[PDB]
Amino acid sequence: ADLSLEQRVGQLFMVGTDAATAEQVTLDAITASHVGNVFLAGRSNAGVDATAAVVEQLTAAVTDEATGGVPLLVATDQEGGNVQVLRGPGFSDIPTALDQGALDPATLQADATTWGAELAASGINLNLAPVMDVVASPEAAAANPPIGYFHREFGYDAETVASHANAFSAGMRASGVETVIKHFPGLGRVTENTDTTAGVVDDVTTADDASVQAFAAGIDAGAAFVMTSTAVYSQIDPDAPAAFSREIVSDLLRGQLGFDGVVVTDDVSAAEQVQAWSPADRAILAIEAGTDIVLVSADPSIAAEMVAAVVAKAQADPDFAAIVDDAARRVLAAKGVA
């Protein structure tokens, strides 16, 4: 499969649709903008069959003209507990990751195999989970708005987090669903939420942090996708949101930690932390940092103009074009495509 420039850029985006409807904006993003991946957003109670029917409409938009026949990555947020997009008939009520952390990894892996089978039956093949963020301690947990507050952490040290998230990943893969470990280099220690607040700075997480050790164990155990944080990490790179940091994404994650797979941004569409940048610059900066998939979930209406901006810069700028081409190659390889 030899994709056009437009189609290769299209592979570097993941555009949201509401979990209960194949939204026209998403369908257009695939057909007119060649977007190659989708994400089911919100909280749906419709159940497995209704979700499969949504996904079927989305995958029906893959054509040779749309994506060169390349199939969609179809993702959702199925962590469990406070973050379970897909619920209802045929779906388990998945416990919080914190509860999952109290299970023998063997038991968690078995339960995650079940959870994965439900995802796969509804047409999902990528889970944006497990969370491998490490929260400092159970007493500090409530003070951490994205992870701790919501019980999305598996535990409070690298070993516990590693053994449970890797168990979760293993069961997920055993049912045909790849995982995305998140959020590198670790979101368990910020005191504000990047969704709703800007200028979020983590002042304690270093490259030696337990969370970075957790991610390493995720990568060593075979992780194929990693999602990056948009927080600013004072002790690693204070000059940019992590997702836009060449140093964090390429030198630390790909270089030091040796990750060869696909790097996914946290949602950059509506998260307050990155609204200071135009949608076009969010995409461009992510990609230049070493990102392979720009997540545009909450507000899919801006996907079209981001795609166009990334195409136009590839046409004008040979260094960025070469970066784009490497990214598309990781994405096609994760999809098993030549």
Side-chain angles (χ1 to χ4, degrees), residues 9-48:
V9 171
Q11 296 292 309
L12 310 187
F13 285 82
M14 187 178 272
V15 60
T17 179
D18 180 71
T21 308
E23 289 194 271
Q24 190 57 47
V25 60
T26 311
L27 292 178
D28 294 340
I30 301 172
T31 307
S33 289
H34 316 279
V35 173
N37 313 286
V38 297
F39 169 84
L40 275 68
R43 301 297 183 261
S44 176
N45 208 48
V48 166

Short mmCIF file of all heavy atoms in Angstrom, two decimals, residues 9-48:
data_model
loop_
_atom_site.label_atom_id
_atom_site.label_comp_id
_atom_site.label_asym_id
_atom_site.label_seq_id
_atom_site.Cartn_x
_atom_site.Cartn_y
_atom_site.Cartn_z
N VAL A 9 -0.55 11.64 5.90
CA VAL A 9 -0.90 12.58 6.94
C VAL A 9 -2.17 12.11 7.66
O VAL A 9 -2.23 12.07 8.89
CB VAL A 9 -1.09 13.98 6.37
CG1 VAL A 9 -1.67 14.88 7.44
CG2 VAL A 9 0.23 14.52 5.92
N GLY A 10 -3.17 11.70 6.89
CA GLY A 10 -4.43 11.23 7.44
C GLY A 10 -4.22 10.12 8.44
O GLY A 10 -4.91 10.05 9.45
N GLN A 11 -3.22 9.27 8.21
CA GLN A 11 -2.95 8.21 9.18
C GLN A 11 -2.45 8.69 10.56
O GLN A 11 -2.46 7.90 11.51
CB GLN A 11 -1.92 7.23 8.61
CG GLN A 11 -2.42 6.52 7.43
CD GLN A 11 -3.52 5.56 7.77
OE1 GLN A 11 -3.39 4.74 8.68
NE2 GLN A 11 -4.64 5.66 7.05
N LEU A 12 -1.96 9.94 10.62
CA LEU A 12 -1.40 10.55 11.84
C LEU A 12 -2.47 11.22 12.72
O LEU A 12 -2.15 11.92 13.69
CB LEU A 12 -0.32 11.57 11.46
CG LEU A 12 0.77 11.10 10.49
CD1 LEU A 12 1.85 12.18 10.38
CD2 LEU A 12 1.39 9.76 10.93
N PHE A 13 -3.74 11.00 12.39
CA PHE A 13 -4.83 11.58 13.18
C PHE A 13 -5.83 10.54 13.68
O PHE A 13 -6.10 9.53 13.02
CB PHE A 13 -5.57 12.65 12.38
CG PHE A 13 -4.81 13.94 12.25
CD1 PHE A 13 -3.83 14.09 11.28
CD2 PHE A 13 -5.09 15.00 13.09
CE1 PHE A 13 -3.13 15.28 11.15
CE2 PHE A 13 -4.40 16.20 12.97
CZ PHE A 13 -3.42 16.35 12.00
N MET A 14 -6.37 10.80 14.87
CA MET A 14 -7.44 9.99 15.42
C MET A 14 -8.61 10.93 15.76
O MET A 14 -8.51 11.77 16.65
CB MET A 14 -6.96 9.21 16.65
CG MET A 14 -8.01 8.20 17.18
SD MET A 14 -7.38 7.14 18.69
CE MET A 14 -6.55 5.69 17.71
N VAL A 15 -9.72 10.81 15.03
CA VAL A 15 -10.81 11.79 15.22
C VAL A 15 -11.96 11.16 15.98
O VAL A 15 -12.34 10.01 15.73
CB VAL A 15 -11.28 12.41 13.90
CG1 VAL A 15 -11.79 11.34 12.96
CG2 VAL A 15 -12.38 13.40 14.16
N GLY A 16 -12.49 11.91 16.94
CA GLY A 16 -13.54 11.44 17.81
C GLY A 16 -14.88 11.38 17.12
O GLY A 16 -15.10 12.06 16.12
N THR A 17 -15.75 10.51 17.62
CA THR A 17 -17.19 10.54 17.35
C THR A 17 -17.83 10.13 18.67
O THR A 17 -17.21 9.45 19.49
CB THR A 17 -17.63 9.58 16.21
OG1 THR A 17 -19.04 9.67 16.04
CG2 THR A 17 -17.32 8.14 16.53
N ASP A 18 -19.06 10.55 18.88
CA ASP A 18 -19.77 10.13 20.06
C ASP A 18 -19.96 8.61 19.98
O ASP A 18 -20.20 8.09 18.89
CB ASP A 18 -21.12 10.84 20.16
CG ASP A 18 -21.88 10.42 21.41
OD1 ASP A 18 -21.44 10.84 22.52
OD2 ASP A 18 -22.88 9.66 21.29
N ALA A 19 -19.86 7.92 21.11
CA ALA A 19 -19.90 6.47 21.11
C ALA A 19 -21.24 5.91 20.61
O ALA A 19 -21.30 4.77 20.19
CB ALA A 19 -19.60 5.93 22.48
N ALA A 20 -22.30 6.71 20.60
CA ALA A 20 -23.59 6.17 20.24
C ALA A 20 -23.97 6.50 18.81
O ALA A 20 -25.01 6.07 18.33
CB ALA A 20 -24.64 6.66 21.21
N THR A 21 -23.13 7.26 18.12
CA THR A 21 -23.48 7.67 16.76
C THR A 21 -22.26 7.84 15.90
O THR A 21 -21.31 8.49 16.32
CB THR A 21 -24.23 9.02 16.70
OG1 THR A 21 -25.35 8.99 17.58
CG2 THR A 21 -24.73 9.29 15.26
N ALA A 22 -22.30 7.30 14.69
CA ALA A 22 -21.30 7.64 13.69
C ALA A 22 -21.59 9.06 13.18
O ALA A 22 -22.35 9.25 12.25
CB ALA A 22 -21.32 6.66 12.54
N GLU A 23 -20.95 10.05 13.80
CA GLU A 23 -21.21 11.44 13.51
C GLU A 23 -20.71 11.82 12.12
O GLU A 23 -19.66 11.37 11.68
CB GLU A 23 -20.54 12.32 14.58
CG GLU A 23 -21.22 12.23 15.97
CD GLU A 23 -20.75 13.34 16.91
OE1 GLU A 23 -19.74 13.13 17.62
OE2 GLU A 23 -21.36 14.43 16.90
N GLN A 24 -21.47 12.66 11.43
CA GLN A 24 -21.13 13.09 10.08
C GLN A 24 -19.75 13.77 10.02
O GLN A 24 -19.00 13.54 9.07
CB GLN A 24 -22.23 14.01 9.52
CG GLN A 24 -22.09 14.32 8.01
CD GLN A 24 -22.06 13.06 7.15
OE1 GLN A 24 -22.89 12.17 7.33
NE2 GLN A 24 -21.10 12.97 6.23
N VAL A 25 -19.39 14.55 11.04
CA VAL A 25 -18.07 15.22 11.09
C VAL A 25 -16.92 14.20 11.03
O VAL A 25 -15.89 14.43 10.38
CB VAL A 25 -17.92 16.14 12.37
CG1 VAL A 25 -18.08 15.35 13.68
CG2 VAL A 25 -16.56 16.90 12.36
N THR A 26 -17.09 13.08 11.73
CA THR A 26 -16.09 12.01 11.75
C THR A 26 -16.02 11.27 10.41
O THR A 26 -14.95 10.99 9.90
CB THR A 26 -16.41 11.02 12.85
OG1 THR A 26 -16.64 11.77 14.04
CG2 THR A 26 -15.25 10.05 13.08
N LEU A 27 -17.18 10.94 9.87
CA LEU A 27 -17.28 10.33 8.56
C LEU A 27 -16.65 11.24 7.49
O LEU A 27 -15.94 10.77 6.63
CB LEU A 27 -18.75 10.03 8.23
CG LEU A 27 -19.44 8.94 9.06
CD1 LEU A 27 -20.90 8.81 8.64
CD2 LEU A 27 -18.74 7.59 8.90
N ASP A 28 -16.93 12.53 7.54
CA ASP A 28 -16.27 13.46 6.64
C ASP A 28 -14.76 13.49 6.86
O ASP A 28 -14.00 13.63 5.91
CB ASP A 28 -16.81 14.89 6.81
CG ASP A 28 -18.29 15.03 6.37
OD1 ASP A 28 -18.81 14.18 5.60
OD2 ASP A 28 -18.92 16.02 6.83
N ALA A 29 -14.32 13.42 8.11
CA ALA A 29 -12.88 13.48 8.42
C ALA A 29 -12.19 12.31 7.73
O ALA A 29 -11.15 12.51 7.13
CB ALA A 29 -12.63 13.45 9.90
N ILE A 30 -12.79 11.12 7.77
CA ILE A 30 -12.27 9.96 7.06
C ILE A 30 -12.33 10.12 5.53
O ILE A 30 -11.36 9.87 4.83
CB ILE A 30 -13.03 8.69 7.44
CG1 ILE A 30 -12.93 8.41 8.92
CG2 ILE A 30 -12.47 7.51 6.68
CD1 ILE A 30 -13.82 7.26 9.34
N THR A 31 -13.49 10.50 5.00
CA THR A 31 -13.67 10.52 3.54
C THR A 31 -13.01 11.72 2.89
O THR A 31 -12.33 11.58 1.89
CB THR A 31 -15.17 10.52 3.16
OG1 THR A 31 -15.82 9.44 3.81
CG2 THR A 31 -15.35 10.34 1.64
N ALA A 32 -13.19 12.91 3.46
CA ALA A 32 -12.67 14.11 2.81
C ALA A 32 -11.28 14.48 3.28
O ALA A 32 -10.51 15.04 2.51
CB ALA A 32 -13.63 15.28 3.03
N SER A 33 -10.94 14.17 4.54
CA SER A 33 -9.61 14.51 5.04
C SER A 33 -8.67 13.28 5.19
O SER A 33 -7.54 13.41 5.65
CB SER A 33 -9.73 15.25 6.39
OG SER A 33 -10.26 16.55 6.20
N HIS A 34 -9.15 12.11 4.80
CA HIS A 34 -8.35 10.87 4.83
C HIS A 34 -7.89 10.48 6.24
O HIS A 34 -6.92 9.72 6.41
CB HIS A 34 -7.13 10.99 3.88
CG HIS A 34 -7.46 11.59 2.55
ND1 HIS A 34 -8.02 10.86 1.52
CD2 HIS A 34 -7.33 12.86 2.08
CE1 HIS A 34 -8.24 11.66 0.49
NE2 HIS A 34 -7.82 12.87 0.80
N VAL A 35 -8.59 10.96 7.26
CA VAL A 35 -8.28 10.54 8.63
C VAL A 35 -8.40 9.01 8.76
O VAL A 35 -9.37 8.38 8.28
CB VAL A 35 -9.17 11.26 9.64
CG1 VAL A 35 -8.97 10.69 11.05
CG2 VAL A 35 -8.83 12.74 9.62
N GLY A 36 -7.41 8.41 9.40
CA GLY A 36 -7.24 6.96 9.33
C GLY A 36 -7.56 6.21 10.60
O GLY A 36 -7.48 4.97 10.64
N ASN A 37 -7.96 6.94 11.65
CA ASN A 37 -8.24 6.32 12.93
C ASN A 37 -9.39 7.06 13.60
O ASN A 37 -9.55 8.25 13.39
CB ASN A 37 -7.02 6.35 13.84
CG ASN A 37 -5.75 5.90 13.13
OD1 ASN A 37 -5.57 4.71 12.87
ND2 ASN A 37 -4.87 6.85 12.82
N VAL A 38 -10.17 6.34 14.41
CA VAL A 38 -11.28 6.94 15.12
C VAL A 38 -11.29 6.57 16.59
O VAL A 38 -10.64 5.62 17.03
CB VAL A 38 -12.63 6.57 14.47
CG1 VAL A 38 -12.70 7.12 13.06
CG2 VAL A 38 -12.79 5.08 14.44
N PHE A 39 -12.03 7.36 17.35
CA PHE A 39 -12.11 7.21 18.77
C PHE A 39 -13.57 7.38 19.18
O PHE A 39 -14.19 8.37 18.82
CB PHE A 39 -11.22 8.25 19.47
CG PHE A 39 -11.44 8.32 20.94
CD1 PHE A 39 -10.79 7.44 21.79
CD2 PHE A 39 -12.32 9.25 21.48
CE1 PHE A 39 -11.01 7.50 23.18
CE2 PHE A 39 -12.54 9.32 22.85
CZ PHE A 39 -11.88 8.43 23.70
N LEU A 40 -14.12 6.45 19.94
CA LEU A 40 -15.50 6.59 20.43
C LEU A 40 -15.54 7.29 21.79
O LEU A 40 -14.98 6.77 22.76
CB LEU A 40 -16.18 5.22 20.51
CG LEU A 40 -16.81 4.73 19.21
CD1 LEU A 40 -15.80 4.43 18.16
CD2 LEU A 40 -17.68 3.51 19.46
N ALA A 41 -16.20 8.45 21.85
CA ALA A 41 -16.11 9.35 23.00
C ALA A 41 -17.38 9.35 23.83
O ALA A 41 -18.42 8.91 23.36
CB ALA A 41 -15.83 10.77 22.56
N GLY A 42 -17.28 9.87 25.05
CA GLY A 42 -18.43 10.04 25.93
C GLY A 42 -18.71 8.90 26.89
O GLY A 42 -17.78 8.30 27.42
N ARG A 43 -19.99 8.62 27.14
CA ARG A 43 -20.41 7.47 27.94
C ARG A 43 -21.63 6.93 27.20
O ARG A 43 -22.62 7.63 27.00
CB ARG A 43 -20.75 7.82 29.43
CG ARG A 43 -19.57 8.46 30.28
CD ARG A 43 -18.32 7.55 30.47
NE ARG A 43 -17.27 8.15 31.32
CZ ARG A 43 -16.16 8.78 30.89
NH1 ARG A 43 -15.88 8.90 29.59
NH2 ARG A 43 -15.30 9.30 31.77
N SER A 44 -21.48 5.72 26.70
CA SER A 44 -22.55 5.05 26.00
C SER A 44 -23.05 3.87 26.80
O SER A 44 -22.26 3.10 27.37
CB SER A 44 -22.10 4.58 24.64
OG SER A 44 -23.15 3.87 24.03
N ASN A 45 -24.36 3.72 26.83
CA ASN A 45 -25.01 2.61 27.51
C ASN A 45 -25.71 1.73 26.48
O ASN A 45 -26.54 0.90 26.84
CB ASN A 45 -26.03 3.13 28.52
CG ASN A 45 -26.25 2.20 29.68
OD1 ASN A 45 -25.28 1.72 30.29
ND2 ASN A 45 -27.52 1.94 30.03
N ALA A 46 -25.41 1.93 25.21
CA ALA A 46 -26.21 1.30 24.17
C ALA A 46 -25.94 -0.21 24.11
O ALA A 46 -26.82 -0.99 23.78
CB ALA A 46 -25.97 1.94 22.83
N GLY A 47 -24.74 -0.62 24.49
CA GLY A 47 -24.38 -2.03 24.48
C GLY A 47 -23.54 -2.47 23.29
O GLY A 47 -23.28 -1.68 22.37
N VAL A 48 -23.14 -3.74 23.30
CA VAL A 48 -22.17 -4.26 22.34
C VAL A 48 -22.66 -4.18 20.89
O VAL A 48 -21.97 -3.63 20.03
CB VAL A 48 -21.78 -5.70 22.69
CG1 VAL A 48 -21.06 -6.34 21.54
CG2 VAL A 48 -20.89 -5.71 23.92
#
